[PDB]
Coordinates of C-alpha atoms and ligand atoms in Angstrom, one line a residue:
Chain Y
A1 CA 0.0 0.1 -0.1
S2 CA 2.2 3.0 1.5
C3 CA 5.2 0.2 1.8
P4 CA 8.1 1.3 0.0
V5 CA 8.3 -1.9 -2.0
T6 CA 7.0 -2.8 -5.2
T7 CA 5.0 -6.1 -5.1
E8 CA 3.8 -6.6 -8.7
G9 CA 5.2 -6.7 -12.1
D10 CA 6.5 -8.7 -15.1
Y11 CA 10.0 -8.7 -13.6
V12 CA 8.9 -8.7 -9.9
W13 CA 8.7 -12.0 -7.9
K14 CA 8.0 -12.9 -4.5
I15 CA 10.4 -14.5 -2.2
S16 CA 8.8 -16.3 1.2
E17 CA 9.4 -19.5 3.2
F18 CA 13.0 -19.0 4.0
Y19 CA 14.5 -21.8 5.8
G20 CA 18.1 -22.6 7.0
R21 CA 19.9 -25.1 8.9
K22 CA 23.3 -24.0 10.6
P23 CA 24.5 -27.3 12.4
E24 CA 27.2 -25.6 14.3
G25 CA 25.6 -22.3 14.5
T26 CA 27.8 -20.9 12.0
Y27 CA 27.7 -21.9 8.4
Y28 CA 24.6 -23.1 6.6
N29 CA 24.3 -26.7 5.8
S30 CA 20.8 -26.3 4.4
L31 CA 19.1 -23.5 2.9
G32 CA 16.0 -22.6 0.8
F33 CA 13.2 -20.4 -0.2
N34 CA 10.2 -20.2 -2.3
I35 CA 9.9 -17.9 -5.6
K36 CA 6.7 -17.1 -7.3
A37 CA 5.5 -14.7 -10.0
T38 CA 3.5 -11.8 -9.0
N39 CA 2.1 -11.0 -12.7
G40 CA -0.3 -14.1 -12.8
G41 CA 2.1 -16.3 -14.3
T42 CA 2.7 -19.9 -13.4
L43 CA 6.1 -19.7 -11.9
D44 CA 6.1 -21.1 -8.2
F45 CA 9.1 -23.1 -7.2
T46 CA 11.5 -23.9 -4.5
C47 CA 15.2 -22.8 -4.6
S48 CA 17.4 -24.7 -2.7
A49 CA 21.1 -26.1 -2.1
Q50 CA 22.6 -28.5 0.5
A51 CA 26.1 -29.4 1.4
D52 CA 28.5 -30.5 4.2
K53 CA 29.0 -26.6 4.3
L54 CA 27.1 -24.2 2.0
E55 CA 29.5 -21.1 1.0
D56 CA 28.9 -17.5 0.8
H57 CA 29.2 -15.7 -2.6
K58 CA 29.2 -18.9 -4.4
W59 CA 26.6 -19.7 -7.2
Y60 CA 24.2 -22.8 -6.5
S61 CA 21.4 -24.1 -8.9
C62 CA 18.1 -23.5 -7.6
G63 CA 17.2 -27.6 -8.3
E64 CA 18.5 -30.0 -10.4
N65 CA 17.0 -28.6 -13.8
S66 CA 16.5 -25.0 -12.8
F67 CA 16.9 -22.1 -15.4
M68 CA 17.8 -20.1 -12.0
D69 CA 21.2 -19.6 -10.0
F70 CA 21.6 -18.2 -6.4
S71 CA 24.0 -16.9 -4.2
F72 CA 24.0 -15.7 -0.5
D73 CA 25.9 -13.4 2.0
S74 CA 25.2 -14.9 5.2
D75 CA 26.4 -11.8 6.9
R76 CA 23.6 -9.5 5.5
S77 CA 20.9 -12.2 4.8
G78 CA 21.3 -11.2 1.2
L79 CA 20.1 -13.1 -1.7
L80 CA 21.3 -12.8 -5.1
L81 CA 19.5 -14.5 -8.1
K82 CA 20.7 -14.6 -11.5
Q83 CA 18.6 -15.8 -15.1
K84 CA 20.6 -15.9 -18.2
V85 CA 17.9 -15.6 -20.9
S86 CA 20.2 -15.5 -23.9
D87 CA 23.8 -15.4 -24.9
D88 CA 23.4 -11.4 -24.6
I89 CA 20.9 -11.0 -21.7
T90 CA 21.2 -11.9 -18.1
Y91 CA 19.0 -10.6 -15.2
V92 CA 20.2 -10.1 -11.6
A93 CA 18.1 -9.1 -8.5
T94 CA 18.7 -8.9 -4.9
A95 CA 17.1 -8.9 -1.7
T96 CA 17.3 -9.5 2.1
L97 CA 15.3 -12.0 3.7
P98 CA 14.8 -11.4 7.2
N99 CA 14.7 -14.5 9.5
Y100 CA 15.1 -15.8 13.0
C101 CA 17.2 -18.5 14.4
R102 CA 16.5 -20.7 17.3
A103 CA 18.0 -23.9 18.6
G104 CA 16.7 -27.0 16.7
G105 CA 17.7 -29.8 18.9
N106 CA 20.0 -31.9 17.1
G107 CA 23.3 -30.9 18.8
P108 CA 24.1 -28.3 21.3
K109 CA 25.2 -25.8 18.6
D110 CA 22.2 -26.5 16.1
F111 CA 20.2 -23.9 15.0
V112 CA 17.1 -23.3 12.5
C113 CA 16.3 -20.4 10.7
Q114 CA 13.2 -19.5 9.1
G115 CA 11.8 -16.5 7.2
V116 CA 9.6 -13.8 9.0
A117 CA 8.7 -11.8 6.2
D118 CA 8.1 -11.9 2.7
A119 CA 10.5 -10.0 0.1
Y120 CA 10.3 -8.9 -3.3
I121 CA 13.1 -8.9 -5.8
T122 CA 13.3 -7.2 -9.2
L123 CA 15.2 -8.4 -12.0
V124 CA 17.3 -6.1 -13.9
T125 CA 19.6 -6.7 -17.1
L126 CA 23.4 -6.6 -16.6
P127 CA 24.9 -4.6 -19.0
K128 CA 26.7 -6.6 -21.9
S129 CA 29.4 -6.9 -20.7
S130 CA 30.8 -5.8 -17.1
Chain P
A1 CA 21.0 -26.1 -43.4
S2 CA 18.7 -26.5 -46.1
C3 CA 16.4 -28.6 -43.7
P4 CA 12.9 -27.2 -43.3
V5 CA 13.4 -26.5 -39.9
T6 CA 14.4 -23.7 -37.8
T7 CA 17.0 -24.5 -35.0
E8 CA 17.6 -21.4 -33.4
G9 CA 15.7 -18.3 -32.1
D10 CA 14.8 -16.6 -28.8
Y11 CA 11.5 -18.8 -28.7
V12 CA 13.2 -22.0 -30.0
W13 CA 14.1 -24.9 -28.1
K14 CA 15.5 -28.3 -28.8
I15 CA 13.8 -31.5 -27.7
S16 CA 16.2 -34.5 -27.5
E17 CA 16.3 -37.7 -25.7
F18 CA 12.9 -38.6 -25.5
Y19 CA 12.2 -42.0 -23.6
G20 CA 8.9 -43.9 -22.7
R21 CA 8.3 -47.2 -21.6
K22 CA 4.9 -49.2 -22.4
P23 CA 4.8 -52.1 -19.9
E24 CA 2.0 -53.6 -21.8
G25 CA 2.7 -52.4 -25.1
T26 CA 0.0 -49.9 -25.1
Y27 CA -0.1 -47.0 -22.9
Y28 CA 3.3 -45.4 -21.3
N29 CA 3.7 -45.3 -17.9
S30 CA 7.1 -43.4 -18.1
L31 CA 7.6 -40.7 -20.5
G32 CA 10.3 -38.0 -20.6
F33 CA 12.6 -35.6 -22.8
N34 CA 15.4 -33.0 -22.5
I35 CA 14.5 -29.5 -23.5
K36 CA 17.2 -27.1 -24.2
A37 CA 17.4 -23.3 -25.3
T38 CA 19.0 -22.6 -28.7
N39 CA 19.4 -18.9 -28.3
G40 CA 22.8 -19.5 -25.7
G41 CA 20.7 -19.0 -22.8
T42 CA 20.9 -21.3 -19.8
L43 CA 17.5 -23.3 -20.0
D44 CA 18.4 -27.0 -19.9
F45 CA 16.0 -29.6 -18.4
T46 CA 14.0 -32.6 -18.0
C47 CA 10.5 -32.8 -18.6
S48 CA 8.8 -36.2 -17.5
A49 CA 5.8 -37.7 -16.0
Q50 CA 5.1 -41.2 -14.4
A51 CA 1.8 -42.8 -13.3
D52 CA 0.6 -46.6 -13.3
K53 CA -1.1 -45.4 -16.6
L54 CA -0.2 -41.9 -18.5
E55 CA -2.9 -40.5 -20.3
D56 CA -3.2 -38.8 -23.8
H57 CA -4.3 -35.3 -24.2
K58 CA -3.6 -34.5 -20.5
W59 CA -1.6 -31.9 -18.9
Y60 CA 1.4 -32.9 -16.8
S61 CA 3.9 -30.8 -15.1
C62 CA 7.5 -31.2 -16.3
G63 CA 9.1 -31.6 -12.8
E64 CA 8.0 -30.9 -9.0
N65 CA 8.6 -27.2 -9.4
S66 CA 8.3 -26.6 -13.3
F67 CA 7.0 -23.9 -15.1
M68 CA 6.1 -25.7 -18.1
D69 CA 3.4 -28.1 -18.8
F70 CA 3.3 -30.5 -21.5
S71 CA 0.6 -33.1 -23.1
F72 CA 1.4 -36.2 -25.2
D73 CA -0.8 -37.7 -28.2
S74 CA 0.6 -40.9 -28.4
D75 CA -1.1 -42.0 -31.4
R76 CA 1.2 -39.6 -33.6
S77 CA 4.1 -38.9 -31.0
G78 CA 3.1 -35.4 -30.7
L79 CA 4.1 -33.2 -28.1
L80 CA 2.5 -30.0 -26.8
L81 CA 4.0 -27.7 -24.4
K82 CA 2.6 -24.8 -22.5
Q83 CA 4.2 -21.7 -20.6
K84 CA 2.0 -19.1 -18.8
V85 CA 4.1 -16.3 -18.5
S86 CA 1.7 -13.7 -17.1
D87 CA -2.1 -13.3 -16.5
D88 CA -2.5 -12.5 -20.3
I89 CA 0.3 -14.4 -22.0
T90 CA 0.5 -18.0 -22.7
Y91 CA 2.6 -19.8 -25.2
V92 CA 2.0 -23.1 -26.7
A93 CA 4.2 -25.2 -29.1
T94 CA 4.2 -28.6 -30.8
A95 CA 6.4 -31.1 -32.0
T96 CA 6.7 -34.8 -33.5
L97 CA 9.3 -36.8 -31.4
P98 CA 10.2 -39.7 -33.6
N99 CA 11.0 -42.4 -31.6
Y100 CA 11.8 -46.3 -32.0
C101 CA 10.3 -49.0 -29.7
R102 CA 11.7 -52.3 -28.7
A103 CA 11.4 -55.1 -26.2
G104 CA 12.4 -54.2 -22.8
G105 CA 12.9 -57.6 -21.3
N106 CA 10.5 -56.7 -18.2
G107 CA 7.4 -58.9 -19.2
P108 CA 6.3 -60.5 -22.2
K109 CA 4.8 -57.1 -23.8
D110 CA 6.9 -54.7 -22.2
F111 CA 8.5 -52.0 -24.7
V112 CA 10.9 -49.2 -24.3
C113 CA 10.9 -46.2 -26.8
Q114 CA 13.6 -43.9 -27.6
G115 CA 14.1 -40.9 -29.5
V116 CA 15.6 -41.3 -33.2
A117 CA 16.0 -37.5 -33.8
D118 CA 16.0 -34.3 -32.2
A119 CA 13.0 -31.9 -32.7
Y120 CA 12.6 -28.1 -32.6
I121 CA 9.6 -26.3 -31.0
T122 CA 8.5 -22.8 -31.6
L123 CA 6.7 -21.0 -28.8
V124 CA 3.8 -19.0 -30.1
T125 CA 1.0 -16.5 -27.9
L126 CA -2.4 -18.3 -27.8
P127 CA -4.9 -15.4 -28.4
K128 CA -6.4 -14.1 -25.4
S129 CA -8.7 -15.5 -25.4
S130 CA -9.9 -18.6 -27.0
Chain I
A1 CA 22.0 -41.0 29.6
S2 CA 19.5 -41.4 32.7
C3 CA 16.8 -40.1 29.7
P4 CA 13.8 -42.6 29.6
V5 CA 14.4 -43.1 25.7
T6 CA 16.8 -45.5 23.8
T7 CA 19.2 -43.6 21.4
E8 CA 20.7 -46.7 19.7
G9 CA 19.8 -49.8 18.3
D10 CA 19.3 -51.5 14.8
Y11 CA 15.7 -50.8 15.1
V12 CA 16.0 -47.5 16.4
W13 CA 16.0 -44.3 13.9
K14 CA 16.7 -40.5 15.1
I15 CA 14.1 -38.1 13.7
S16 CA 15.2 -34.4 13.5
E17 CA 14.8 -31.4 11.8
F18 CA 10.9 -31.5 11.8
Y19 CA 9.3 -28.7 9.6
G20 CA 6.1 -27.9 8.6
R21 CA 3.8 -24.8 6.9
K22 CA 0.4 -24.1 7.9
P23 CA -0.6 -21.6 5.3
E24 CA -3.8 -20.9 7.2
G25 CA -2.8 -21.8 10.8
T26 CA -4.5 -25.0 10.3
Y27 CA -4.1 -27.9 8.0
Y28 CA -0.3 -28.3 7.0
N29 CA 0.4 -28.0 3.2
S30 CA 4.2 -28.9 3.7
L31 CA 5.5 -31.4 6.2
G32 CA 8.9 -32.9 6.7
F33 CA 11.6 -34.6 8.7
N34 CA 15.1 -36.1 8.7
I35 CA 15.5 -39.9 9.7
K36 CA 18.8 -41.4 10.5
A37 CA 20.0 -44.8 11.7
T38 CA 21.9 -44.9 14.8
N39 CA 23.7 -47.9 14.5
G40 CA 26.5 -46.8 12.1
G41 CA 24.4 -47.6 9.2
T42 CA 24.3 -45.3 6.3
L43 CA 20.5 -44.6 6.4
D44 CA 19.8 -40.6 6.4
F45 CA 17.2 -39.2 4.4
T46 CA 14.4 -36.7 4.2
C47 CA 10.9 -37.7 4.6
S48 CA 8.5 -35.2 3.3
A49 CA 5.0 -34.5 1.6
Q50 CA 3.0 -31.4 0.1
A51 CA -0.3 -31.2 -1.2
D52 CA -2.6 -28.0 -1.2
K53 CA -4.0 -29.9 2.0
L54 CA -2.3 -32.5 3.8
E55 CA -4.6 -35.0 5.8
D56 CA -4.2 -36.4 9.3
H57 CA -4.0 -40.3 9.3
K58 CA -3.3 -40.7 5.9
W59 CA -0.2 -42.6 4.5
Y60 CA 2.1 -40.7 2.4
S61 CA 5.6 -41.8 0.9
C62 CA 8.4 -40.5 2.4
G63 CA 9.8 -39.4 -1.2
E64 CA 9.5 -40.7 -5.0
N65 CA 11.2 -43.8 -4.6
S66 CA 11.1 -44.3 -0.9
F67 CA 10.5 -47.7 0.8
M68 CA 9.1 -46.0 3.7
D69 CA 5.7 -44.6 4.6
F70 CA 4.6 -42.3 7.0
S71 CA 1.4 -40.8 8.6
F72 CA 0.8 -37.6 10.9
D73 CA -1.6 -36.9 13.5
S74 CA -1.3 -33.3 13.8
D75 CA -3.6 -33.0 17.1
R76 CA -0.8 -34.5 18.9
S77 CA 2.4 -34.3 16.9
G78 CA 2.4 -37.7 16.1
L79 CA 4.5 -39.5 13.9
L80 CA 3.8 -43.0 12.4
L81 CA 6.1 -44.8 10.0
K82 CA 5.7 -48.2 8.2
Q83 CA 8.1 -50.2 6.3
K84 CA 6.8 -53.6 4.5
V85 CA 10.0 -55.7 4.6
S86 CA 8.6 -58.7 3.0
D87 CA 5.2 -60.2 1.9
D88 CA 4.8 -61.2 5.9
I89 CA 6.8 -58.6 7.8
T90 CA 5.7 -55.0 8.1
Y91 CA 7.5 -52.7 10.7
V92 CA 5.7 -49.6 12.3
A93 CA 7.1 -47.1 14.8
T94 CA 5.7 -44.1 16.5
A95 CA 6.7 -40.8 18.0
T96 CA 5.8 -37.0 19.1
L97 CA 8.1 -34.8 17.0
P98 CA 7.9 -31.5 19.2
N99 CA 7.8 -28.3 17.8
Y100 CA 7.2 -24.7 17.8
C101 CA 4.9 -22.5 15.3
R102 CA 5.5 -19.0 14.8
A103 CA 4.2 -16.5 12.1
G104 CA 5.9 -17.2 8.5
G105 CA 4.9 -13.5 6.9
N106 CA 3.5 -14.8 3.9
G107 CA -0.3 -13.9 4.8
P108 CA -2.0 -13.1 7.9
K109 CA -2.5 -16.6 9.0
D110 CA 0.8 -18.2 7.9
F111 CA 2.6 -20.3 10.5
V112 CA 5.9 -22.1 10.3
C113 CA 6.6 -24.6 12.6
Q114 CA 9.9 -26.5 13.5
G115 CA 11.6 -29.2 15.5
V116 CA 12.5 -28.0 19.1
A117 CA 13.8 -31.3 19.9
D118 CA 15.2 -34.9 18.6
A119 CA 12.8 -37.9 18.7
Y120 CA 13.8 -41.7 18.4
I121 CA 11.5 -44.1 17.2
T122 CA 11.8 -48.1 17.6
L123 CA 10.6 -50.2 14.7
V124 CA 8.4 -53.1 15.8
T125 CA 6.7 -56.1 13.9
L126 CA 3.1 -56.0 13.1
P127 CA 1.3 -59.1 13.8
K128 CA 0.4 -61.3 10.7
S129 CA -2.2 -60.7 10.7
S130 CA -4.3 -57.7 12.3
Chain W
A1 CA 11.9 -72.1 -14.1
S2 CA 15.0 -74.3 -15.5
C3 CA 17.0 -70.9 -15.5
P4 CA 20.3 -71.0 -13.8
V5 CA 19.2 -67.9 -11.9
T6 CA 17.3 -67.1 -8.3
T7 CA 14.5 -65.1 -9.0
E8 CA 13.3 -64.6 -5.6
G9 CA 14.3 -64.2 -2.1
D10 CA 15.0 -62.0 1.0
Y11 CA 18.1 -60.9 -0.4
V12 CA 17.5 -61.2 -4.1
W13 CA 16.3 -57.9 -6.3
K14 CA 15.2 -57.5 -9.8
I15 CA 17.1 -55.1 -11.8
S16 CA 15.1 -53.7 -15.2
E17 CA 14.7 -51.0 -17.4
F18 CA 18.5 -50.0 -17.6
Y19 CA 19.2 -46.8 -19.5
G20 CA 22.5 -44.9 -20.6
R21 CA 23.3 -42.4 -22.7
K22 CA 26.9 -42.1 -24.4
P23 CA 27.0 -38.4 -26.0
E24 CA 30.1 -39.1 -27.8
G25 CA 29.8 -42.9 -27.9
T26 CA 32.4 -43.6 -25.2
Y27 CA 31.7 -42.7 -21.5
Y28 CA 28.1 -42.3 -20.1
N29 CA 26.6 -39.0 -19.1
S30 CA 23.5 -40.3 -17.7
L31 CA 23.0 -44.1 -16.5
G32 CA 19.9 -45.5 -14.7
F33 CA 17.9 -48.6 -13.9
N34 CA 15.0 -49.8 -11.5
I35 CA 15.5 -52.0 -8.3
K36 CA 12.5 -54.1 -7.0
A37 CA 12.2 -56.4 -4.0
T38 CA 11.3 -59.9 -5.0
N39 CA 9.9 -61.1 -1.6
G40 CA 6.9 -59.1 -1.6
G41 CA 8.3 -56.2 0.1
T42 CA 7.8 -52.7 -1.0
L43 CA 11.0 -51.7 -2.5
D44 CA 11.0 -50.4 -5.8
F45 CA 12.9 -47.4 -6.9
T46 CA 15.4 -45.8 -9.4
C47 CA 19.2 -46.0 -8.9
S48 CA 20.7 -43.1 -11.4
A49 CA 23.4 -40.6 -11.8
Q50 CA 24.5 -38.0 -14.2
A51 CA 27.2 -36.0 -14.4
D52 CA 29.6 -34.4 -17.8
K53 CA 31.3 -37.4 -17.6
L54 CA 30.3 -40.8 -15.4
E55 CA 33.5 -42.8 -14.4
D56 CA 33.8 -46.4 -14.3
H57 CA 34.5 -48.2 -10.7
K58 CA 33.3 -45.0 -8.6
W59 CA 30.6 -45.2 -6.1
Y60 CA 27.4 -43.0 -6.9
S61 CA 24.5 -42.6 -4.5
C62 CA 21.4 -44.3 -6.2
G63 CA 19.5 -40.7 -5.3
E64 CA 19.6 -37.8 -3.0
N65 CA 18.6 -39.8 0.0
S66 CA 19.3 -43.1 -0.8
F67 CA 20.8 -45.8 1.5
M68 CA 22.3 -47.5 -1.7
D69 CA 25.2 -46.8 -3.6
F70 CA 26.2 -48.3 -7.0
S71 CA 29.3 -48.6 -9.2
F72 CA 29.5 -49.6 -13.1
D73 CA 32.2 -51.2 -15.2
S74 CA 31.0 -50.0 -18.6
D75 CA 33.5 -52.5 -20.2
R76 CA 31.6 -55.5 -19.0
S77 CA 28.3 -54.0 -18.3
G78 CA 28.8 -54.8 -14.7
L79 CA 26.8 -53.5 -11.9
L80 CA 27.9 -53.3 -8.4
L81 CA 25.6 -52.3 -5.5
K82 CA 26.6 -51.4 -1.8
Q83 CA 24.2 -51.4 1.2
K84 CA 25.7 -50.5 4.8
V85 CA 23.4 -51.9 6.9
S86 CA 25.2 -51.3 10.4
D87 CA 28.8 -50.5 11.6
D88 CA 29.5 -53.9 10.9
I89 CA 27.4 -55.3 8.3
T90 CA 27.6 -54.2 4.4
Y91 CA 26.0 -56.1 1.6
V92 CA 27.3 -56.2 -1.9
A93 CA 25.9 -57.4 -4.9
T94 CA 26.7 -58.0 -8.7
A95 CA 25.1 -58.2 -11.8
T96 CA 25.6 -57.9 -15.8
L97 CA 23.0 -55.8 -17.3
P98 CA 22.8 -56.7 -21.1
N99 CA 21.9 -53.4 -23.2
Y100 CA 21.5 -52.5 -26.7
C101 CA 22.9 -48.9 -27.7
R102 CA 21.9 -47.1 -30.9
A103 CA 22.3 -43.7 -32.4
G104 CA 20.0 -40.9 -30.1
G105 CA 20.1 -38.3 -32.5
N106 CA 21.6 -35.7 -30.9
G107 CA 25.0 -35.5 -32.4
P108 CA 27.0 -37.5 -34.6
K109 CA 28.3 -39.8 -32.0
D110 CA 25.3 -39.8 -29.8
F111 CA 24.2 -43.2 -28.5
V112 CA 21.6 -44.4 -26.0
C113 CA 21.6 -47.6 -24.6
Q114 CA 18.5 -49.6 -23.2
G115 CA 18.1 -53.0 -21.1
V116 CA 17.0 -55.9 -23.3
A117 CA 16.7 -58.0 -20.2
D118 CA 16.1 -58.2 -16.4
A119 CA 18.9 -59.2 -14.1
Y120 CA 18.7 -60.4 -10.6
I121 CA 21.1 -59.7 -7.8
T122 CA 22.0 -61.5 -4.6
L123 CA 23.3 -59.6 -1.5
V124 CA 25.9 -60.9 0.5
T125 CA 27.7 -59.8 3.5
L126 CA 31.2 -58.3 3.4
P127 CA 33.7 -60.2 5.7
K128 CA 34.5 -57.6 8.7
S129 CA 37.0 -56.7 7.8
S130 CA 38.7 -57.2 4.0
Ligands
8AC201 N1 5.7 -9.1 -22.6 C1 6.1 -10.0 -21.7 C2 6.7 -9.8 -20.5 C3 6.6 -10.9 -19.3 C4 8.1 -11.2 -19.2 C5 8.4 -11.8 -18.0 C6 9.7 -12.6 -17.8 C7 10.3 -12.8 -16.4 C8 11.5 -13.7 -16.3 O1 11.6 -15.1 -16.5 O2 12.6 -13.0 -16.1
8AC202 N1 14.4 -10.0 -25.7 C1 14.3 -11.0 -25.1 C2 13.7 -12.3 -25.6 C3 14.3 -13.5 -25.0 C4 13.0 -14.1 -24.4 C5 13.2 -15.7 -24.4 C6 12.1 -16.1 -23.7 C7 11.8 -17.6 -24.0 C8 10.5 -18.5 -22.9 O1 10.6 -18.5 -21.8 O2 9.6 -18.5 -23.5
8AC203 N1 21.5 -58.5 11.7 C1 20.8 -57.4 11.1 C2 20.3 -56.5 11.9 C3 20.3 -55.0 11.2 C4 19.1 -55.0 10.6 C5 18.5 -53.5 10.6 C6 17.0 -53.5 9.7 C7 16.6 -51.8 10.1 C8 15.4 -51.7 9.0 O1 15.5 -51.1 8.3 O2 14.2 -51.6 9.6
8AC204 N1 13.7 -62.1 8.3 C1 13.8 -60.8 7.6 C2 14.4 -60.9 6.3 C3 14.3 -59.9 5.4 C4 15.3 -59.0 5.3 C5 15.7 -58.4 3.9 C6 16.9 -57.3 4.0 C7 16.8 -57.0 2.3 C8 17.7 -55.8 2.3 O1 17.6 -54.4 2.7 O2 19.1 -55.9 2.2
0FU205 N1 9.5 -26.7 2.6 C1 10.8 -27.0 2.7 N2 10.9 -26.5 4.2 C2 12.1 -27.0 4.5 N3 12.7 -26.8 5.9 C3 13.0 -28.2 3.8 N4 14.0 -28.6 4.4 C4 12.4 -28.6 2.9 O1 13.1 -29.6 1.8 N5 11.3 -28.0 2.1
0FU206 N1 16.0 -26.0 2.6 C1 14.9 -26.2 2.0 N2 14.0 -25.2 2.0 C2 12.9 -25.1 0.9 N3 11.8 -24.1 1.1 C3 12.7 -26.3 0.4 N4 11.8 -26.8 -0.2 C4 13.8 -27.2 0.4 O1 13.6 -28.3 -0.7 N5 14.9 -27.1 1.1
0FU207 N1 10.0 -10.0 -23.5 C1 10.1 -11.3 -22.7 N2 11.4 -10.9 -22.2 C2 11.9 -11.8 -21.3 N3 13.3 -11.5 -20.7 C3 11.3 -13.3 -21.1 N4 11.5 -14.3 -20.3 C4 10.1 -13.3 -21.8 O1 9.2 -14.5 -21.9 N5 9.7 -12.2 -22.8
0FU208 N1 11.4 -40.9 -18.5 C1 12.4 -40.0 -18.3 N2 12.9 -39.5 -19.2 C2 14.0 -38.7 -18.9 N3 14.7 -38.3 -20.0 C3 14.2 -38.0 -17.8 N4 15.2 -37.2 -17.5 C4 13.4 -38.7 -16.7 O1 13.4 -38.3 -15.2 N5 12.4 -39.6 -16.9
0FU209 N1 9.0 -29.9 4.6 C1 10.3 -30.4 4.4 N2 10.9 -30.5 5.3 C2 12.1 -31.2 5.0 N3 13.0 -31.6 5.9 C3 12.7 -31.5 3.4 N4 13.7 -32.0 3.3 C4 11.9 -31.1 2.6 O1 12.3 -31.8 1.6 N5 10.6 -30.8 2.9
0FU210 N1 12.8 -44.2 -16.5 C1 13.7 -43.3 -16.7 N2 14.4 -43.4 -18.0 C2 15.3 -42.7 -18.6 N3 16.1 -42.6 -19.6 C3 15.7 -41.3 -17.8 N4 16.3 -40.6 -18.2 C4 14.8 -41.1 -16.6 O1 15.0 -40.0 -15.7 N5 14.0 -42.1 -16.3
0FU211 N1 19.1 -42.5 -16.4 C1 18.0 -42.8 -15.5 N2 17.5 -44.0 -15.9 C2 16.6 -44.1 -15.2 N3 15.9 -45.4 -15.1 C3 15.5 -43.0 -14.4 N4 14.6 -43.4 -13.4 C4 16.5 -42.0 -14.1 O1 16.0 -41.1 -13.2 N5 17.6 -41.7 -14.9
0FU212 N1 17.5 -59.6 9.6 C1 17.5 -58.6 8.8 N2 18.4 -58.4 8.2 C2 18.8 -57.1 7.6 N3 19.9 -57.1 6.6 C3 17.7 -56.4 7.3 N4 17.6 -55.1 6.3 C4 16.3 -56.3 7.8 O1 15.2 -55.8 7.9 N5 16.5 -57.7 8.8

């Protein structure tokens, strides 16, 4: 409404249901979130990754097939998405995914984090080239 | 080259590695194929479905998350894809996926089919509305 | 240690990282948890299900391939697992999966639940027959 | 019947619907097969792997969660399975998966292979230790 955020558009997607697990309270071993189109299109999918230790500032596929890559900066809960549409067109988008972490019960430094608010991202073309 | 087929374009995708299984030599219980962008974009994924009995002229998701649906007419090896880009824009596309079936060994009427040639599809906008 | 729970055995598995989403604060649309062997075997996997509305007291596969089924009673956070080992042998197992739900941000009655403690299940043979 | 093969048992599984793709007619980039219990138990799943280049004599998980690993010797179409049941018990099993390869259409040296017969494997305990 009067929120300083655009919540609909052909190049605007909603990010929701952020999850992550920090098995030792530091790095994530599991991270994910839902991505949905806002323009009445069909797109609605999970973007996630797992590893013994997930890295910051590293591209992960959103899934086995996915046309989308993502990267995370855990220090700022910052998400970066990338979509390469053609040889010459790539979109990127960013957001903060606010979340709350609490003890998960599976070890003395095990924490699980979940989103406390949705975020909206805008996809914008990267100049060809850098 | 001199083939009566367009093999590159922003709205042209390559279909390859068609597979299917007909457990009793009639209906499919498993069907799939690979879809790849031709314009240098990243898109490259598997579209598939399984059921005790897959139906002709029925939409199946390409995968759990997928932004794409497909339907198959097994009588003509005809594929139909659909992509709903927005409230008002939907693309559809069609092709024939030539294939060869041979005995699969898992029952006396078990046949497995695999693609013998790639196919190229063109995505075109459905008039709003029918 | 002095806890009234068995945490290791060939037929004892650890349940951890319970998650669930209640989009309208009532039924789950997403539920899952991790299952791990305690006896030094390799088994370690996710059991989950999604639907527009998940049902209580209904078997869901743990995953596409899984040899395990589960059911949930949301009124008591009660889990039931079933493993059919042979024509004549089926194991079942139960537990409570304690969890905490909090607002998820994706709608005014959206809640996300996560496990606050691990649980241990014991697999026991169902008499042949009921 | 009078076949020199055991087709049923608690430790005997049926292997069927072998598939593989050799993009350049040499190494596989995709390999898979179905595994089913013969004793009336529920087990029935796909074991597969993909990579730019799959390696011989290397363990691959059967799937993301799987309790089973496999390895393949492409020179003899030989399959090896491994199941670690406990700290001290591991089963292994072997078979030949007969198959036929034919041109797949997606490049001049692209071949796709599919099983021509089912195979039966027997799981047997590895002595503790080697
Ligand atoms: N006129 C067509 C506008 C809809 C384009 C939306 C593309 C979003 C994307 O996948 O980045
Ligand atoms: N100028 C942008 C043209 C590239 C658009 C390709 C969209 C293909 C699709 O997902 O249907
Ligand atoms: N002596 C063999 C004992 C290990 C059996 C564990 C089986 C657990 C299961 O999948 O239910
Ligand atoms: N008496 C119980 C016998 C059934 C055991 C089958 C175990 C097969 C496996 O997962 O290797
Ligand atoms: N929706 C969802 N949330 C999660 N925490 C996980 N792990 C998962 O796989 N899917
Ligand atoms: N970590 C994680 N979060 C999610 N939301 C999902 N779907 C998933 O599979 N994994
Ligand atoms: N005009 C247009 N641009 C895009 N980036 C996409 N994906 C699309 O479908 N149409
Ligand atoms: N039937 C089928 N075909 C395919 N090409 C793939 N990837 C799949 O998962 N299933
Ligand atoms: N809901 C849910 N929870 C999980 N722990 C996982 N792995 C999953 O895929 N989905
Ligand atoms: N049943 C099946 N066969 C295949 N060739 C493939 N690729 C797949 O994913 N599933
Ligand atoms: N290569 C391959 N073969 C299969 N039989 C299956 N299920 C799969 O996913 N991939
Ligand atoms: N006696 C027995 N041995 C095994 N190896 C397994 N898996 C099982 O369920 N029961």
